[PDB]
Symmetry: C2
Subunit: 127 residues, 2 copies
Amino acid sequence: SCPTPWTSFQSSCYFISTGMQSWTKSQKNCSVMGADLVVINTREEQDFIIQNLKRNSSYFLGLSDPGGRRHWQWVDQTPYNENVTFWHSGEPNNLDERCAIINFRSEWGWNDIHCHVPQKSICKMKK
Amino acid sequence: SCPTPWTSFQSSCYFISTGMQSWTKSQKNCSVMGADLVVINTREEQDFIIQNLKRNSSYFLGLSDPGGRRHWQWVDQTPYNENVTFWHSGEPNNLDERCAIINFRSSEWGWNDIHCHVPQKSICKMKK
């Protein structure tokens, strides 16, 4: 009961992109189709996904680190409280974003990557 | 009642280094003296510290990010659980460390983040 270009597993529909776009644009592409970049909840889901991928291809997952604030720690384990700090204006530097891909090494598994690189992607639509 | 080269404030002793070393070596230097790189708990402590620093100098604080694992998130807010992942061996990349300094800018005193291996002066705090 999934749209034609989609494949069903359990009560979800999956779309394997053919285009290469950044993580943000890939998520947008999933979004307008009523989907998200793929969230892998179970081992069975990972196995189904890899049976629908091409070994010569790399795909964005719906897994990322948005970056932003670092998890600062005092050296004596005094709790760090952001609200009582004395950072100079515009400090400290924001942590950069990072994104995850699934691909095949000669097997299948995840790797981290810059979010702005063009990769293929996997969308999941809840059915 | 602090050792001679140290200054007292409340029930703590403070040492202002003259030497420039990495964060790790600065912490080690504090450690062998029975101290830590300075942890700033209160506003009065920050004010006392800045009254004992030189405006042309930058000093490591006992504040850092050890790096390591990133705080990964699923796009639909499913909790990320590291124990049920499929990362390739040696993946993902560790986040790099970062360290904090106190120094003076024209218009005044405040903290900045910095690479941990840069030589800076340092402040030690000893519990009395």
